[PDB]
Amino acid sequence: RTMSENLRRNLAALEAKISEAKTKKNMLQARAKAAKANAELQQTLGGLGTSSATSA
Amino acid sequence: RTMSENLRRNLAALEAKISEAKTKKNMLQARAKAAKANAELQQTLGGLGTSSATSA
DSSP: HHHHHHHHHHHHHHHHHHHHHHHHHHHHHHHHHHHHHHHHHHHHHHHHHHHHHOOO | HHHHHHHHHHHHHHHHHHHHHHHHHHHHHHHHHHHHHHHHHHHHHHHHHHHHHOOO
């Protein structure tokens, strides 16, 4: 029973790290695509400069 | 929700600046053509000088 329960620690770790990596995949991918849009919002603050380039 | 609402600030800014630029287009064009007529009214005050040029 003693070493077997340490295998249960090990298996509990495998599922924990793998499942957490799956939620990281969602969060990071979502955050990445979102960040491309937020970067385009910074660029849209820069869009005011692109209109300025002929507003003169 | 936090960064998304900042995209709503950004989009609210895009529409605000663009729509205001559209009302500026109307006001400035109208004012420009109007000003050409008002300049012709100053010139018409000058028309009194053009008649003076043979009133002598």
